[PDB]
Design a protein around this ligand. Structure first.
Ligand SMILES: [Mg+2]
Ligand SMILES: [Zn+2]
Ligand SMILES: [Zn+2]
Ligand SMILES: [Zn+2]
Lengths: 112, 84, 107, 171, 177, 270, 97, 551
């Protein structure tokens, strides 16, 4: 019902300039500050302080700081989020980068 | 470790992303002097020839569709429906 | 289930873990006046069995983690008498679907 | 001594090769790199046995370039020396410092101080020998070497040995 | 670079490798514990001179078949046939394979996979190491005094009466070069 | 903030909404599973009217002379009357519409039918009437058996989570419930022959065009749904030039920053 | 010009992951470094002319990797190192999920 | 991409195991001995000694000498050194957990005050979260500020457990910038909890104990939170930016290293020789100061420690902090190659998917097409035009990677191209590019157009695309990015094309509309009142590009 009050409270911000946004865009963010177990802020003490790898969080608000507790508490990076691959100059698992492509010697041999 | 070709909850349609990367990897390879599995019917642009390759569905590429849990499923360019 | 008028002694409520496995639930009369659950805003919450919970993770390929977690203190998670681990299948409605299956793990 | 370790190889063929009989070039590239080679770890990778049955793999293409990575899992004939085990080998070079032995594709070396006292050097012989009671070690002599020391000289592992201890020496 | 069948998780802990000794302490790949890629807990297999030779001679015979298929569309006497196949199905620059074949068709204790067979049926059966089989089968020993010495790995591993019997059998079974 | 939070989050192959670990947000993206733009505001005719207007428009009763589709509507119209199993069929048809009626009257008790729904069913029939030159002069060929069941088969081939189990089959039914209620409103037996007068040929085109237009509507696994959610919130938030609350812009920073010290707290009791 | 902050955001919503690799690297910092297997630090004394890939301390010349990261990333790593923080880059993961 | 091949296998970065530098490892991992602040030159004699620069780190002045690695300047990554600190130093930021652990561990035996005998400590030891395990242990052990020699068992209270020895009280630890302050009581004695005294206890701490805290005996131990070995950063982190030739150019980081090097040999003088004790704590506190300074200057410790210029000194913290501070302006954001910013003007003739590109911009922006028999012949014409004629080539990259800079080559006309070569040809008519109007807050704000090489110095665009980009022809400035990968230009053309985003996923409506002249003209024409006569009609009908030619 929290997800609810938060959503209704945001849709009546979409109407605060009359403009439309499909349910899905807000209902995702509304579900982000809910899927934790309660209510979480869209700040460095909500999303940037949780579970995500040492580099996904240091990329916003607090940096040197976040990276310092990555060091002392011998932390680890997945290399699974955006921000992770971003730093490394790699093809992140985003859209075209998600799936990997190979060649079947078999399907390759058929054509000739 | 993976998953077999029977047991696929993965959309049997190619994604607009898979289209762009197959048609791109073929654009790269075909410009990289790579073998052309289609008759070069007046076609000379690498990226273009690669498009008349997905047409004749004679691209040797297979897509590794990884599940976010860990394991994966395989699909060839022939295996994917192109209703894109 | 103890239904007190004002409160219970903290001297007394320390005698709650005293008789295991049996769990002792405590609710003040105050929130019971109105049915907290029968609200417009809160959808159905369902106690999912050991097998129902396992099946969720086995098919939807999830982990004890990955799940959208639930509060223990959730007026629901006490109205259902929920304990840690239990899965709550929630049937919320959608502006663009009609129904959608959400699952929570109790903390 | 000579054993068979199942090993892997990362051959990354370029797009111009992704055509019908590619399996022939993936196997060839393997026989180039792995065959003839000597590592520090697995010793002399002498022969990539049974050419026919070789893992091919559906290899991943890069975003960068069209090239695809292939790991080839093979069964090969290997040989690595060890400190203490005795092996037969035909002698090759000789002088004042000692004589070198040819144990397979590997060179063991016996120093003058690794040979008995009675087994002394003779520069006054063509080609140089090693005088004793009956024992006269020339060049194409047959010897039993106790591999006292193993040294990995990168693309080839060479060694040190002794014929001093009992039973060892001339074959 | 060619990677191994054996792999672990030695993260940060770099201090590796304990002195190689004939005392059956070998490489991380070279132990009774290693895997055959097919997912089998295969014990390392070491071969004595000849049990060896007649494997490269085996798969190089197998290789001649392939190259000519895809092209369609007596000791001193064996020494020649040895370098013949090497100038064929072998790279030609394969110096490390050539040296080995000549020395193996010189020093080999058994000329035939008929005779090599009975030898290995008798050796890996004794209850000894695949490494001792490979040392008894190539180094023509006589006394257990001599034997347990050149291969210390035995010492108490076998009956001094037995070690002899085993070796004595191999002396008739020995090729007649 | 919105985009650094909703970064990692996308659409996956389980047809789930996950991220940088695999933590699920939605078990089907958008509680439905469609590609944001493919959706045009469609109308649910089943909620609307008096339970009597609905009856005239939808109920077919091939037992009563005053409720039988006249042989001016279907070629079978004169013989399809007074049939046992044929009216027994239609019962499921009108009863499923009354089922759909209160269902939609439970999800939205404000009546409004003008909801964002994928696959414009209007446009497909629009095209059918002029791409088949259906003459609403002579009766439609179709049998009552053709229509009721033709939908009952189309209803299956409209998929989101391709799964073969329990839940994957279950949250799937849940996902395409609303679309199916709209499907049932347009492709209802009476509305099909009385209003539309479309052939088996045209009807099959209406069913065919809906099917694939829908499987195109499936969200593409990979689509950065998260970044996109934020890039559709953060973008028009800028344009905000602002019985008394906080006017949009400060109101947003109260909810996004999660404020308990509300600039305008207000309790509304019915 | 700048393919900066949000200039990245929008690209991510698209799907062109390999345009983002091309942008942040090829048309920017792009660097060929030599990290050790064990301590995944830019330790390696890479004598490219004569293949002596010797590593200081970790006794390596054996398992060594060439990694492709933008110079700004290798630089930022060298930067937190001089603040006693090890960004040990492993070519091979050991996490699973 | 790095320059010059290496036989080293190439790969992904799959994990980044963050940790601490063992003051044990720092030493080993060093090629340089770093002993004196005489940087470069051996008394102005243009070279370098065993000092701050290349005692074996990496030379400046377009030269090799980088301890066997040499590899010029580019392909030469920096080589780290070391410096042994004269007394342990509290690592500026790890000073937090230093106070914290100290309130948990017995400052005598190296054992947590509380253990498996206290139920909430047990509840804590169980928490599987690495710093929340600490979170509770800290809150728990800070309380009992006396370790128990003996304490009653979990079964009966007359039954005690001698668990761990020592019954000595814990201090009330409070900050004082660079040294902690204790406290035990008759009358309160506050102890100067010194770096040396503190580190000792940390060494003793039971593996299982720092394990039950946020620590690790492989990557990051608490005994390394205190530095004895400072790693000396190589010169491509603290450059030598020389003016002409006979003038210095060291970065402010090289200064604070020199200012530590001073402060190290100062504490060495007082120590190794006549000991002044309560004067040694000055050279100690200045070394302790400058080691904490060189990392962070912009802190809670009032002196920003200004260098003699009034400059706080470029803190390694300030070098990584937000927007243009590495992570947010050099890593997440960047300045890229193959880019173009130009003024915008309207257009009633271009298609929605076409972009205005002046001749000069098309002649400045290059694309590398691979010499394949399809192109080759035409690329060879580009090759004999260079960068003066619109279709030409800037450089021609050999099979080997040698840049044949067409512009000044002697064989510039000859150029006998082979396959596998790359000709760097100008970007031309109907080619793909990422056109963009800042800020890029929208997926729709960064879209792909089709080059149409126009004269006149402005970036022109179709007037219906005036709305999805946030456009107004008041001289708006837009970007342009040239893809190089035939894979990358496949990525623009398939997800970034303008015709695709006509319909807005953001709100389920189309986000491109016909504006102004077209918005008023169409209505002024679609009236019952308005008509047209044959001569003007025929011009109108012909004007439709794909008209059937049917009147
Ligand atoms: Mg403006
Ligand atoms: Zn190392
Ligand atoms: Zn160097
Ligand atoms: Zn103590």
């Amino acid at each position: 019902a929290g997800r609810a009050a938060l959503y209704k409270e945001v849709y009546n911000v979409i109407a605060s300039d009359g403009s439309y946004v499909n349910y899905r865009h807000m209902a995702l963010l509304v579900d982000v500050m809910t899927t934790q177990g309660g209510l979480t802020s869209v700040t460095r003490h909500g999303f940037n302080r949780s579970n995500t790898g040492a580099l996904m969080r240091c990329s916003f608000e607090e940096t040197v700081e976040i990276l310092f507790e990555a060091g002392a508490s011998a932390e680890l990076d997945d290399c699974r989020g955006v921000s992770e691959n971003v730093i490394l100059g790699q093809m992140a698992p985003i859209g075209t980068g998600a799936f990997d492509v190979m060649i079947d010697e078999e399907s390759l041999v058929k054509y000739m | 470790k993976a998953i077999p070709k029977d047991q696929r909850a993965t959309t049997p349609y190619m994604t607009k992303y898979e289209r762009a990367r197959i048609l791109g990897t073929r654009a790269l390879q075909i410009s990289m002097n790579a073998p052309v599995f289609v008759d070069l019917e007046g076609e000379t642009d690498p990226l273009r020839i690669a498009m008349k390759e997905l047409a004749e569905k004679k691209i040797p590429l297979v897509i590794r569709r990884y599940l976010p849990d860990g394991s994966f499923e395989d699909w060839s360019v022939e295996e994917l429906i192109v209703d894109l | 289930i103890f239904v007190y008028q004002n409160n219970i002694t903290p001297s007394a409520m320390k005698l709650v873990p005293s008789i295991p496995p049996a769990t002792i639930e405590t609710f003040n009369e105050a929130a019971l006046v109105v049915n907290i659950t029968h609200h417009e805003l809160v959808p159905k919450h369902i106690r999912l069995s050991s097998d129902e919970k396992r099946e969720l993770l086995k098919r939807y390929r999830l982990k004890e983690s990955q799940l959208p977690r639930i509060q223990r203190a959730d007026p629901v998670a006490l109205y259902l008498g929920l304990k840690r681990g239990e899965v709550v299948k929630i049937i919320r409605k959608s502006e663009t679907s009609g129904r959608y299956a959400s699952y929570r793990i109790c903390m | 001594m000579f054993f068979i370790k199942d090993l892997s190889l990362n051959i990354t063929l370029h797009p111009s090769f992704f055509g019908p009989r590619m399996k022939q070039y993936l196997k060839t590239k393997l026989l180039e790199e792995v065959e003839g080679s000597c590592t520090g770890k697995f010793g002399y990778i002498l022969c990539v046995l049974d050419y026919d049955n070789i893992d091919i793999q559906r290899g991943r293409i890069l975003p960068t370039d069209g090239s695809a990575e292939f790991n080839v899992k093979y069964r090969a004939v290997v040989f690595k020396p060890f400190k203490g085990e005795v092996v037969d080998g035909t002698v090759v070079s000789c002088s004042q410092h000692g004589f070198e032995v040819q144990v397979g594709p590997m060179k063991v070396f016996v120093t003058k101080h690794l040979m008995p006292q009675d087994l002394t050097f003779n520069a006054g012989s063509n080609p140089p020998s090693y005088q004793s009671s009956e024992d006269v070690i020339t060049i194409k002599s047959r010897i039993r070497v106790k591999i006292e020391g193993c040294i990995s000289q990168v693309s080839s592992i060479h060694a040190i040995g002794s014929i001093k201890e009992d039973y060892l020496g001339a074959i | 670079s060619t990677s191994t069948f054996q792999t672990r998780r030695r993260r940060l802990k770099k201090v590796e490798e304990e002195e190689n000794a004939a005392t059956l302490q070998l490489g991380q790949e070279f132990q009774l514990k290693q895997i055959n890629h097919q997912g089998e807990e295969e014990e390392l297999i070491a071969l004595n001179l000849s049990e060896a030779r007649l494997v490269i001679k085996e798969a190089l015979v197998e290789r001649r078949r392939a190259f000519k298929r895809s092209q369609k569309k007596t000791r001193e006497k064996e020494l020649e046939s040895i370098d013949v196949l090497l100038e064929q199905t072998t790279g030609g620059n394969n110096k490390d394979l050539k040296n080995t074949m000549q020395y193996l068709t010189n020093f080999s204790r058994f000329r035939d996979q008929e005779t090599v067979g009975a030898v290995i049926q008798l050796l890996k059966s004794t209850g000894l190491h695949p490494f001792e089989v490979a040392q008894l089968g190539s180094l023509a020993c006589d006394t257990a005094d001599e034997a347990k010495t050149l291969i210390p790995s035995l010492n108490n591993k076998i009956s001094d009466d037995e070690l002899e019997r085993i070796l004595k059998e191999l002396s008739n079974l020995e090729t007649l070069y | 903030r919105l985009v650094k939070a909703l970064e990692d989050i996308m659409v996956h192959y389980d047809n789930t909404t996950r991220n940088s670990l695999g933590n699920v947000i939605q078990f089907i993206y958008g509680e439905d599973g469609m590609d944001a733009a493919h959706i045009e505001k469609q109308s649910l005719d089943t909620i609307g009217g008096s339970d009597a207007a609905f009856e005239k428009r939808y109920r077919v009763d091939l037992l009563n002379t005053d409720h039988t589709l006249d042989p001016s509507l279907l070629e079978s119209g004169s013989e399809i009357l007074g049939d046992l199993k044929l009216q027994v069929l239609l019962d499921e048809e009108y009863k499923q519409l009354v089922k759909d009626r209160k269902f939609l009257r439970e999800v939205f008790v404000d009546g409004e039918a003008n909801w964002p729904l994928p696959v414009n069913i209007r446009r497909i029939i629009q095209n059918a009437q002029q791409t088949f030159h259906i003459d609403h002069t002579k009766p439609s060929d179709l049998t009552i058996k053709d229509i009721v069941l033709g939908v009952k088969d189309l209803q299956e081939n409209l998929l989101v989570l391709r799964g073969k189990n329990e839940i994957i089959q279950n949250a799937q039914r849940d996902a395409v419930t609303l679309f199916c209620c709209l499907l049932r409103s347009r492709l209802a037996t009476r509305r099909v022959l009385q209003e539309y007068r479309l052939t088996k040929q045209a009807f099959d085109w209406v069913l065919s065009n809906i099917e694939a237009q829908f499987l195109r509507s499936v969200v593409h696994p990979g689509e950065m749904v998260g970044v996109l959610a934020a890039q559709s919130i953060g973008e028009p938030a800028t344009q905000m030039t602002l019985k008394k609350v906080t006017s949009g812009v400060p109101r947003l920073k109260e909810i996004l920053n999660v404020a308990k010290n509300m600039k305008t707290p207000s309790l509304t009791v019915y | 010009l700048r393919f900066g902050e949000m200039e990245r955001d929008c690209m991510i919503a698209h799907g062109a992951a390999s345009f983002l690799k091309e942008r942040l690297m090829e048309a920017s910092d792009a660097f060929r470094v030599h990290i050790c297997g064990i301590c995944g630090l830019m330790t390696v004394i890479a004598k490219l002319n004569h293949n002596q890939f010797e590593c200081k301390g970790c006794d390596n010349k054996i398992d060594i990797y060439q990694i492709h990261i933008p110079y700004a990333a290798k630089l930022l790593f060298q930067e937190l190192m001089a603040m006693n923080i090890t960004p040990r880059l492993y070519t091979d993961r050991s996490r699973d999920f | 991409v790095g320059q010059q091949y290496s036989s080293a296998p190439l790969r992904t970065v799959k994990e980044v195991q963050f940790g601490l530098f063992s003051p044990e490892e720092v030493r080993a991992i060093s090629v340089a001995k770093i002993r004196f602040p005489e940087t470069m030159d051996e008394t102005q004699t243009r070279a370098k000694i065993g000092g701050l620069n290349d005692p074996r780190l990496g030379s400046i002045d377009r030269n090799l000498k980088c301890q066997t690695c040499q590899e010029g300047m580019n392909e030469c990554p920096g080589h780290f050194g070391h410096i042994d600190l004269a007394k342990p130093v509290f690592h500026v930021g790890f000073i937090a957990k230093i106070k914290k652990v100290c309130e948990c561990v017995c400052m005598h035996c190296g054992k947590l005050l509380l253990d498996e005998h206290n139920e909430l400590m047990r509840q804590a030891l169980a928490i599987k979260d690495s710093k929340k395990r600490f979170a509770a242990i800290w809150t728990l052990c800070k309380t009992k500020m006396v370790c128990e020699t003996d304490v009653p068992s979990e079964d009966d209270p007359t039954q005690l457990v001698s668990r761990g020895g020592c019954g000595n009280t814990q201090p009330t630890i409070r900050k004082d910038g660079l040294k902690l302050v204790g406290s035990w009581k008759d009358e309160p004695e506050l102890r100067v909890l010194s770096t040396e005294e503190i580190l000792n206890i940390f060494k003793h701490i039971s593996v299982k104990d720092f394990t039950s805290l946020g620590f690790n005996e492989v990557f990051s131990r608490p005994e390394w939170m205190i530095l004895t070995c400072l790693p000396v950063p190589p010169p491509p982190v603290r450059p030598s930016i020389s003016f002409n030739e006979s003038q210095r150019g060291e970065d402010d980081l090289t200064f604070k290293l020199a200012d530590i090097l001073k402060a190290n040999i100062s504490l060495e003088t007082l120590e190794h020789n006549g000991a002044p004790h309560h004067a040694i704590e000055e050279a100690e506190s200045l070394l302790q100061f400058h080691v904490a300074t060189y990392m962070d200057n912009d802190i809670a410790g009032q002196p920003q420690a200004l260098q003699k210029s009034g400059r706080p000194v470029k803190s390694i913290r300030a070098r990584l902090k937000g927007k243009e501070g590495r992570i947010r302006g050099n890593l997440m954001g960047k300045r890229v190659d193959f880019s173009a910013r130009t003024v915008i003007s309207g257009d009633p003739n271009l298609e929605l998917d076409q972009v205005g590109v002046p001749k000069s911009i098309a002649k400045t922006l290059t694309y590398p097409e691979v010499v394949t028999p399809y192109n080759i012949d035409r690329l060879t014409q580009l090759v004999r035009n260079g960068p003066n004629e619109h279709p030409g080539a800037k450089y021609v990259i050999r099979d080997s990677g040698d840049r044949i800079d067409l512009r000044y080559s002697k064989r510039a006309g000859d150029i006998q191209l082979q396959y596998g070569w790359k000709v760097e040809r100008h970007i031309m008519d109907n080619d793909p590019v990422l056109f963009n109007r800042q800020p890029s807050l929208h997926k729709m704000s960064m879209m792909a157009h089709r080059v149409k090489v126009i004269p006149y110095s402005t970036f022109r665009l179709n007037l219906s695309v005036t709305s999805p980009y946030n456009a107004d022809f008041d001289g708006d400035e837009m970007n342009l990015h040239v893809p190089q990968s035939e894979e990358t230009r496949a990525e623009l053309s398939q997800l970034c094309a303008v015709p695709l985003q006509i319909v807005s996923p953001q709100s389920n409506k189309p986000c491109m509309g016909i504006v102004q002249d077209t918005l008023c003209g169409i209505r002024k024409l679609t009236l019952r009142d308005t008509f047209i006569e044959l001569d003007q009609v025929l011009n109108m009908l012909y004007w439709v590009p794909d008209w059937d030619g049917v009147i």
